[PDB]
Write an enzyme that holds these catalytic residues in place. Structure first.
Site, PDB file in Angstrom:
ATOM      1  N   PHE A  17       0.847  -1.188   0.000  1.00  0.00           N
ATOM      2  CA  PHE A  17       0.000   0.000   0.000  1.00  0.00           C
ATOM      3  C   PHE A  17       0.868   1.218   0.000  1.00  0.00           C
ATOM      4  CE2 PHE A  17       0.910  -0.350   4.448  1.00  0.00           C
ATOM      5  CZ  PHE A  17       0.860   0.945   4.937  1.00  0.00           C
ATOM      6  N   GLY A  18       0.300   2.325  -0.458  1.00  0.00           N
ATOM      7  CA  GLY A  18       0.984   3.599  -0.449  1.00  0.00           C
ATOM      8  C   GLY A  18      -0.024   4.685  -0.204  1.00  0.00           C
ATOM      9  N   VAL A  23      -2.820  -2.869  -2.593  1.00  0.00           N
ATOM     10  CA  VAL A  23      -2.812  -4.073  -3.441  1.00  0.00           C
ATOM     11  C   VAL A  23      -3.170  -5.294  -2.600  1.00  0.00           C
ATOM     12  CG1 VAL A  23      -1.450  -5.549  -5.003  1.00  0.00           C
ATOM     13  CG2 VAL A  23      -0.947  -3.092  -4.857  1.00  0.00           C
ATOM     14  N   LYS A  38      -5.140  -4.110  -7.435  1.00  0.00           N
ATOM     15  CA  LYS A  38      -4.820  -2.773  -6.973  1.00  0.00           C
ATOM     16  C   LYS A  38      -6.094  -1.968  -6.906  1.00  0.00           C
ATOM     17  CE  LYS A  38      -0.846  -0.221  -7.897  1.00  0.00           C
ATOM     18  NZ  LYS A  38      -0.026   0.967  -8.263  1.00  0.00           N
ATOM     19  N   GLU A  91      -1.470  -9.873 -12.798  1.00  0.00           N
ATOM     20  CA  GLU A  91      -0.868 -11.168 -12.474  1.00  0.00           C
ATOM     21  C   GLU A  91      -0.289 -11.117 -11.064  1.00  0.00           C
ATOM     22  OE1 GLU A  91       3.183 -12.615 -14.153  1.00  0.00           O
ATOM     23  OE2 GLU A  91       2.816 -10.826 -15.366  1.00  0.00           O
ATOM     24  N   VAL A  93       2.337 -11.957  -8.364  1.00  0.00           N
ATOM     25  CA  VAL A  93       3.740 -12.283  -8.315  1.00  0.00           C
ATOM     26  C   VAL A  93       3.997 -12.713  -6.892  1.00  0.00           C
ATOM     27  CG1 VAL A  93       6.123 -11.418  -8.594  1.00  0.00           C
ATOM     28  CG2 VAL A  93       4.320 -10.552 -10.086  1.00  0.00           C
ATOM     29  N   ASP A 136       9.674   5.560 -12.829  1.00  0.00           N
ATOM     30  CA  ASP A 136       9.655   5.284 -11.394  1.00  0.00           C
ATOM     31  C   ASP A 136      10.423   3.979 -11.124  1.00  0.00           C
ATOM     32  OD1 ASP A 136       6.945   5.156  -8.889  1.00  0.00           O
ATOM     33  OD2 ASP A 136       8.900   6.070  -8.760  1.00  0.00           O
ATOM     34  N   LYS A 138      12.889   1.849  -9.414  1.00  0.00           N
ATOM     35  CA  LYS A 138      13.496   1.851  -8.096  1.00  0.00           C
ATOM     36  C   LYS A 138      13.283   0.461  -7.516  1.00  0.00           C
ATOM     37  CE  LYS A 138       9.967   4.377  -5.662  1.00  0.00           C
ATOM     38  N   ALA A 140      11.665  -0.724  -4.909  1.00  0.00           N
ATOM     39  CA  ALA A 140      10.293  -1.027  -4.488  1.00  0.00           C
ATOM     40  C   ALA A 140       9.361  -1.369  -5.658  1.00  0.00           C
ATOM     41  CB  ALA A 140       9.716   0.104  -3.693  1.00  0.00           C
TER      42      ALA A 140
HETATM   43  N1  LIG Z   1       1.046  -7.882  -9.153  1.00  0.00           N
HETATM   44  C1  LIG Z   1       1.578  -7.980  -7.868  1.00  0.00           C
HETATM   45  N2  LIG Z   1       1.821  -9.139  -7.268  1.00  0.00           N
HETATM   46  C2  LIG Z   1       2.328  -9.207  -5.995  1.00  0.00           C
HETATM   47  N3  LIG Z   1       2.528  -8.092  -5.256  1.00  0.00           N
HETATM   48  C3  LIG Z   1       2.308  -6.867  -5.783  1.00  0.00           C
HETATM   49  C4  LIG Z   1       1.811  -6.737  -7.121  1.00  0.00           C
HETATM   50  N4  LIG Z   1       1.627  -5.433  -7.395  1.00  0.00           N
HETATM   51  C5  LIG Z   1       2.031  -4.766  -6.307  1.00  0.00           C
HETATM   52  N5  LIG Z   1       2.448  -5.616  -5.350  1.00  0.00           N
HETATM   53  C6  LIG Z   1       2.956  -5.268  -3.996  1.00  0.00           C
HETATM   54  O1  LIG Z   1       2.506  -3.999  -3.527  1.00  0.00           O
HETATM   55  C7  LIG Z   1       3.535  -3.024  -3.498  1.00  0.00           C
HETATM   56  C8  LIG Z   1       3.007  -1.740  -4.064  1.00  0.00           C
HETATM   57  O2  LIG Z   1       2.831  -1.929  -5.457  1.00  0.00           O
HETATM   58  P1  LIG Z   1       2.814  -0.696  -6.313  1.00  0.00           P
HETATM   59  O3  LIG Z   1       4.248  -0.345  -6.604  1.00  0.00           O
HETATM   60  O4  LIG Z   1       2.109  -1.111  -7.535  1.00  0.00           O
HETATM   61  O5  LIG Z   1       2.025   0.380  -5.557  1.00  0.00           O
HETATM   62  P2  LIG Z   1       2.112   1.923  -5.506  1.00  0.00           P
HETATM   63  O6  LIG Z   1       3.581   2.325  -5.460  1.00  0.00           O
HETATM   64  O7  LIG Z   1       1.436   2.457  -6.716  1.00  0.00           O
HETATM   65  C9  LIG Z   1       1.293   2.510  -4.081  1.00  0.00           C
HETATM   66  P3  LIG Z   1       1.002   4.257  -3.919  1.00  0.00           P
HETATM   67  O8  LIG Z   1       1.013   4.929  -5.245  1.00  0.00           O
HETATM   68  O9  LIG Z   1      -0.347   4.464  -3.348  1.00  0.00           O
HETATM   69  O10 LIG Z   1       2.008   4.879  -2.974  1.00  0.00           O
HETATM   70  C10 LIG Z   1       4.667  -3.639  -4.326  1.00  0.00           C
HETATM   71  O11 LIG Z   1       5.935  -3.220  -3.863  1.00  0.00           O
HETATM   72  C11 LIG Z   1       4.474  -5.107  -4.083  1.00  0.00           C
HETATM   73  O12 LIG Z   1       5.025  -5.382  -2.804  1.00  0.00           O
HETATM   74 MG   LIG Z   2       1.160   4.306  -7.226  1.00  0.00          MG
HETATM   75 MG   LIG Z   3       5.218   1.411  -6.392  1.00  0.00          MG
END
Ligand SMILES: Nc1ncnc2c1ncn2[C@@H]1O[C@H](COP(=O)(O)OP(=O)(O)CP(=O)(O)O)[C@@H](O)[C@H]1O
Ligand SMILES: [Mg+2]
Ligand SMILES: [Mg+2]
Length: 260
Positions: A17-18, A23, A38, A91, A93, A136, A138, A140
């Site tokens: 989450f962010g 997710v 998501k 998908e 992961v 983006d 990085k 994470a």
């Molecule tokens: N398809 C997937 N399968 C497994 N885990 C996933 C995934 N998509 C995202 N995640 C998990 O969730 C985290 C956040 O994913 P993502 O990078 O897509 O979010 P985000 O950066 O957009 C959140 P925000 O924008 O709200 O701060 C990833 O680091 C991963 O740990």
């Molecule tokens: Mg995001």
């Molecule tokens: Mg992210």
């Protein structure tokens, strides 16, 4: 956030989450497989500025079909007591981010680091050939499977033509494929040493360093690293775009040479 979305995807545990989304592990009830879903925050869903960016993320990632990029299966807006709740089905992961790996296990062996970044280069290069710049890149946003496969994700600010920002991107300049190359260089520096090229007590300081300061060669920070690997990382992290790998394919070709 509800039990099921569209009477179809049964939501399970939070995976990440962010600030603008979360997710979930979910079960597709029609197809009988686990998926990653998501979901946009909902109070933000009523905001056109956020609603549109979230839809654009889905569209950008859906434009890409590659085994090292997280695939998009579906998208919708679920009905809730709050109102419409935007979601993206991806998908699943089963793995961890490079951020988690470096934080728990420390730097990777050079060999594993080379394989992981070579695979990331290949994904990014594909993105670029399809007219999409990620922006983006990085740790994470890169995961490693339970099968050791690399999966690049998060097209939240991708565009269709602090510690990880390229100097051009810092200035909100024209950023191109060579900006993703630089960010990959940063990620590589970090999985090889355990630390990114620049740190500082603030974002502007980290930014000042990206623009003005040469990175410390990786071998001087961590033992067991070749002069050739130093050269590859340091070329990816060149200040002038003209001095980096011109494409991610070129970066990969040089990493493969270090390997072989
Ligand atoms: N398809 C997937 N399968 C497994 N885990 C996933 C995934 N998509 C995202 N995640 C998990 O969730 C985290 C956040 O994913 P993502 O990078 O897509 O979010 P985000 O950066 O957009 C959140 P925000 O924008 O709200 O701060 C990833 O680091 C991963 O740990
Ligand atoms: Mg995001
Ligand atoms: Mg992210």
């Amino acid at each position: 956030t509800p039990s099921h979305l569209s009477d179809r995807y049964e939501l399970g545990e939070i995976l990440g989450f962010g600030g603008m989304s979360e997710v979930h592990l979910a079960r597709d009830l029609r197809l009988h497989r686990d998926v990653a879903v998501k979901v946009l925050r909902a109070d933000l869903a009523r905001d056109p500025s956020f609603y549109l960016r979230f839809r654009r993320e889905a569209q950008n990632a859906a434009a890409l079909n590659h085994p090292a990029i997280v695939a998009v299966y579906d998208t919708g807006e679920a009905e809730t007591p709050a109102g419409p709740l935007p979601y993206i089905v991806m998908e699943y992961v089963d793995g961890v981010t490079l951020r988690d790996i470096v934080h728990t296990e420390g730097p990777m062996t050079p060999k594993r680091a080379i394989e992981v970044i070579a695979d990331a280069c290949q994904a990014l290069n594909f993105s670029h050939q399809n007219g999409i710049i990620h922006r983006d890149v990085k740790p994470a946003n890169i995961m490693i499977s339970a099968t050791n496969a690399v999966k690049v994700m998060d097209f939240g600010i991708a565009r269709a033509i602090a510690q990880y920002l390229s100097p051009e991107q810092a200035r909100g300049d024209s950023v191109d494929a060579r900006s993703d190359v630089y960010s990959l260089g940063c990620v590589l520096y970090e999985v090889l040493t355990g630390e990114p090229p620049f740190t500082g007590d603030s974002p502007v300081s980290v930014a000042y360093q990206h623009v003005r300061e040469d990175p410390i060669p990786p071998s001087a920070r961590h033992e067991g690293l070749s002069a050739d690997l130093d050269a590859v990382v340091l070329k990816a992290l060149a200040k002038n775009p003209e001095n980096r790998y011109q494409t991610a394919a070129e970066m990969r070709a040089d990493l493969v040479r270090v390997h072989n």
